[PDB]
Design a protein around this ligand. Structure first.
Ligand SMILES: OC[C@H]1O[C@H](O[C@@H]2[C@@H](O)[C@@H](O)O[C@H](CO)[C@H]2O)[C@H](O)[C@@H](O)[C@@H]1O
Ligand SMILES: OC[C@H]1O[C@H](O[C@@H]2[C@@H](O)[C@@H](O)O[C@H](CO)[C@H]2O)[C@H](O)[C@@H](O)[C@@H]1O
Lengths: 729, 303, 304
């Protein structure tokens, strides 16, 4: 209560030096209960100053002056100046007004979105402040909706300046941390809106195995249940809780077959038409909810109702879980209306996520975003994106920006959901992004033409998709370790560049560029290739330091902004000198944790990586060319070491140290080989190819090689050749 | 009209002529004050060049060497000497690349691709340097012409081009620092040798005269109106022209008909970025492709 | 007035601020004690150093506890305060709503440097007479952003010289100075000629100023004030009367390079009209496209 101040009809709680709760109450009673958004207001004491007069109060922290002149909250009575100079005159917050600078957050869904859509604000601002209004209902101690807050205005003023990571950590302290995901969530998911049989689904899973594509999750979309078989008097077949017996004559046996293949199983649930009289569970639900069965009274969807929720979980979901369903895909698109005023999507995510923990430890849902704090109910499901280059070009930005409201587990339909147009290169670029996204779930529309199976495409596209799908499983150790860091430390897997580089203007000018964990920087290509180059491109900002392409070892001297070119089969992913990345050596092998880790080391600096696991922690240190691996607990795990180009240690057990000062630091990547390959694939004149190869071979001085390419009439070819010269400088 | 006069001044003969039109007079004061002043400056330069031209004329007559040579006379085995049709040697000390295309209005500058042979080259007017061998697009305002001299070049100029006198009473010896050089000034009744050897400049003549010699070494007049044969040591004197990247960058950005935000960003970034390779990488991102080439010319000269 | 300012110790004493907590004297023009400390202890010492009048440059919104726009409070009170030390003194500030003509001069602010901005500005200026706000001062040549074009700068100065106020101003760019010698010799000489013409016109302007003050007649009138029943008086947005003896049709479009001349469609009312500079005659009534070199402006005077 030292950090609590009352003045007129207002209450101010100084939670941190940079976070102030602001309340109004007509009744002089203020709200202590949790809300849909806020789970915890216990924060360590902080120092601040007050100037309290007859008519006014000023609260002063290290970063903000908050002023209240009494009366009802207006833009004139309640306002704040930040103690920063990030702008010339955008340093003042006025109650109920917008200011410039917000770096945005996320939105409910990408349903029906072709390219960009507007986002809600987040808690991050280039000008150093943000206000997060709490407009939600209060909860009970066990987490049911209690009704309206007695704080009829309840706001959180964030004044973290450009300390974005601390703003997000303290947001997680206020709204609750993200829970740990289970390891299975981080592998490849298969999904398709397609009327598979038990037989054709298992045949497809076995084809994945034959094709060397690993999967963690088998999604079964809505054709699992009755659709066309629903009498039209009941409405549509969109909602269903009854297996189609022609396609799934023995559901538990089919789910047992997926479980024997080490797949987790989820079903699509369209909840909005509730439980109607044709459904297999209807007789039990009708008994529980005292429905008029002779008038075929439906159990209408009503998540405000405790008895409805219990019948839904116990008598509708329950029998399907007993057949082996592992977790629920909540696919809600029917609006925000309820008698309580609570969004039905929030009620579903909150209650289903809680219910999911009963049968499985660290279980998930798959559902759309339900507003600030809904990160407590992973995973995010963005929905029915339009299949286009424009949609892909929006999606990396969308994903990293979501970290600004703490929603760090978006699962996008990889390759896009529906409508749009066919382009196998779009499908391949989208999968590249997906593999370097929070979740890699392949999914598609009801079209006969939109399957994301790699072997849908030509041999080049197929092989590249298989390679990227294998890479996702190689990355599960790195992903699972980052997941435990999200849960315990409040750090997002995917960060916008400005989290690490808040004072670099270029960190705000590369919307689709992001940090992926702590060791990798990703610049997805999201534009159709230039046919004259047979390469796509993206402008990359390289921070200070020496950077390596993660795949090729091509080097780049930061700090620089440089257009980079890749063939459709290659993705721009970069690691600094000293980076250490663990990889599963056996990504196809079905085993709860890897029996073998590859330690991939980028030479040129010291580094360190901590591999967090279910039942271990393993530290890899690279210090003055000595690489050491230690673990809390011992195991039979075999460690492989790759130092730049070369495997140094194969399948060594236990803790150890090896000196790498003696070993070759340099990657094989060389200017001449890369130049020949770019000229060779280009759809340009052979005379141009001959002249460029000859002149760049003959001209010795780097500055004169650049002058030569500066004369080229092909402006994009100049930029491609300039990237090679910059790396070879 | 102005570009054509620039070429004419660096051609065998500079004869202004026109049609029967009331509208085609080549009088400088036909044009606006900027065009007029530039035409007057080039017309004065033609008379400053008469000593150099007359000496080359006597070399045509006695030695069979053309005043104007295609690049391939001096550089027969260089492919680039066959790829710059409008580029030529003008006497033995100067290389000319006339601009013969209408200016790019976004830059307020015309341009020409110049082949620089091996060696260090200087713009004859500005001292802007270029390291050969390179092919480089060069940009000039409509009032300026690409004319180049190698390190060690010695060019005589009439100090008094308006003065009516059968032979100049005063010669300016314009010396380009950085190498040895030599020039023989053939005249009606004399030969005068200017030698630049290990930083010692010597002037000797067959016959004596009252002619007064002026010496300009790079930027600076060293000797004013000295009579007779003499020698002066220039090892002690400033070799460098004033030409500098920063001044030239500001002028190009200032005249350009582009966005002020672009001007501000380019000036700021090229001032802040220290490493030459990263300055080039910055200009490589510019959406204006010709502006890239203009900024690249300045970075190449400032490397 | 924040705690680092030279006048802060005096303002802190007057307004009983907590100096050890560095309490700022926040802007509050609703507050009599704040206004008096602002005029007497903040402006006052700067006026004593010789400041003649105040450029009030307010861009931070319309919010106050009173509901009165802070810009109105500034213009109303500063204009009144300015009369203490100088007779008929001015301010320079943005428009604060109907009646704010009582506090000249108008300051239009941070226009984008473009042909489009110039093409709007004569219309903007004459139309303002319709709410009695007749002393707009525009940044001549445009304020910020936009693009370089020495002809735009010259056309903008031509308009400025025939506008209520001729104030050259620019952005923080190293590249946007309005100095005539920034430009080439042709542009420089023309800008110098127009700048000299502004001072030649001060007698005419000062006489019109006294007519605004005493008779309620704007210096700049839309054509329809003099010709209310002529449809063509509503079809020449940038054309205006300038005092009672001159009619101005600024050129606000980039020249046609084939002609080396810009142009504007001029409506000539009934009567015999002369170009003010050349004496070129025109028989009204007619609508006629007129062409001028970039150094010449269409300004006309009737016979007599
Ligand atoms: O469960 C089937 C799919 O339903 C939702 O998407 C629908 C889409 O595939 C198509 O049929 O259009 C409608 C109307 O826009 C969508 O509601 C889910 O978004 C999707 O993931 C399912 O596969
Ligand atoms: O006092 C400096 C200038 O401030 C205002 O204009 C600013 C402008 O020059 C630039 O910095 O952008 C900001 C944001 O749009 C403007 O506030 C005045 O309008 C101007 O007259 C001053 O010169």
């Amino acid at each position: 209560n030292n950090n609590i101040i009352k003045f007129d009809k207002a209450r101010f709680t100084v939670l941190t030096e940079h976070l102030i709760r602001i309340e109004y109450s007509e009744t002089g009673e203020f709200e202590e209960r949790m809300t849909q958004m806020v789970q915890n207001r216990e924060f360590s004491e902080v120092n601040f100053d007050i100037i309290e007069k007859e008519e006014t109060i000023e609260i002063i922290t290290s970063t903000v002056h908050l002023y209240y002149n009494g009366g009802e909250f207006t833009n004139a009575s309640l306002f704040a100046d930040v103690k920063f100079n990030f702008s010339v005159y955008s340093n003042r917050w006025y109650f109920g007004e917008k200011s410039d600078g917000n770096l945005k957050g996320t939105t409910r869904t990408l349903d029906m979105i072709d390219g960009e859509c507007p986002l809600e604000d987040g808690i991050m601002s280039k000008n150093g402040f943000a206000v997060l209004a709490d407009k939600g209902k209060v909860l009970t101690e066990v987490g049911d909706i209690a009704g309206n807050s007695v704080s009829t205005i309840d706001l959180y003023l964030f004044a973290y300046g450009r300390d974005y990571r601390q703003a997000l950590k303290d947001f997680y302290q206020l709204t609750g941390n993200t829970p740990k995901l289970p390891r299975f969530a981080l592998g490849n998911w298969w999904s398709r809106y397609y009327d598979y049989s038990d037989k054709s689904y298992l045949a497809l899973m076995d084809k994945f195995t034959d094709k060397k594509v690993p999967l963690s999750v088998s999604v079964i979309d809505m054709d699992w249940h009755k659709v066309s078989e629903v009498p039209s008097r009941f409405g549509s077949g969109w909602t269903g809780y009854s297996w189609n017996k022609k396609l799934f004559p023995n559901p538990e046996n089919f789910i047992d077959e997926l479980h024997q293949r080490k797949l987790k199983v989820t079903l699509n649930d369209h909840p909005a038409d509730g439980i109607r009289a044709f459904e297999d569970p209807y007789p039990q639900v009708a008994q529980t909810l005292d429905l008029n069965t002779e008038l075929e009274e439906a159990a209408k969807f009503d998540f405000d109702n405790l008895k409805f929720r219990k019948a839904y979980f116990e008598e509708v979901h329950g029998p399907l879980e007993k057949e082996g369903v592992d977790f629920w895909w909540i696919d809600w698109q029917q609006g925000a209306i309820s008698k309580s005023g609570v969004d039905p999507l929030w009620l579903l995510n909150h209650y289903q996520y809680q219910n999911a923990q009963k049968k499985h430890k660290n279980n998930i849902i798959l559902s759309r975003y339900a507003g600030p704090g809904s990160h407590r109910y992973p995973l995010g499901f963005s929905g029915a994106s339009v299949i286009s280059w424009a949609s892909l070009d929006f999606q990396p930005y969308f994903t990293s920006t979501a970290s600004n409201i703490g929603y760090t587990w978006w699962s996008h339909d990889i390759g896009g959901h529906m409508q749009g147009y066919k382009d196998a290169e779009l499908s391949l670029r989208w999968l590249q992004f997906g593999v370097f996204s929070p979740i890699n779930r392949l999914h598609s529309s009801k079209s006969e033409f939109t399957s994301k199976e790699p072997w849908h495409f030509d041999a080049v596209i197929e092989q590249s998709m298989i390679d990227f799908l294998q890479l996702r499983h190689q990355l599960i150790p790195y992903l699972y370790s980052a997941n435990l860091i999200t849960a315990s430390e409040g750090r997002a897997l995917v960060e916008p560049l400005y989290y690490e580089y808040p004072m670099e203007e270029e960190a705000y000018q590369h919307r689709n560029q992001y940090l992926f964990g702590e060791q990798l920087m990703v610049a997805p290509i999201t534009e159709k290739m230039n046919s004259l180059l047979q390469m796509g491109s993206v402008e990359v900002w390289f921070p200070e330091g020496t950077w390596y392409d993660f795949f090729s070892g091509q080097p780049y001297d930061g700090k620089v902004s440089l257009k980079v070119y890749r063939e459709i089969t290659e993705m721009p992913v970069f690691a600094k000198a000293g980076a250490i990345i663990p990889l599963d050596k056996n990504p196809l092998k079905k085993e709860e944790i890897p029996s073998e880790i590859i330690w991939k080391i980028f030479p040129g600096a010291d580094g360190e990586y901590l591999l967090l696991e279910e039942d271990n922690e393993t530290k890899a240190e690279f210090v003055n060319g000595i690489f050491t691996v230690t673990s809390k607990k011992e195991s039979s795990r075999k460690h492989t070491i790759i130092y730049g180009e070369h495997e140094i240690v194969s399948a060594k057990r236990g803790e150890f140290s090896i000196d790498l000062n003696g070993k070759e630091e340099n990657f094989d990547w060389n200017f001449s080989t890369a130049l020949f390959r770019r000229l060779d694939i280009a759809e340009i004149s052979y005379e141009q190819k001959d002249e460029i190869l000859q002149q760049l071979s003959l001209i010795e001085e780097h500055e004169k090689q650049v002058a030569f390419i500066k004369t080229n009439e092909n402006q994009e070819l100049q930029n491609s050749l300039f990237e090679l010269l910059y790396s070879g400088k």
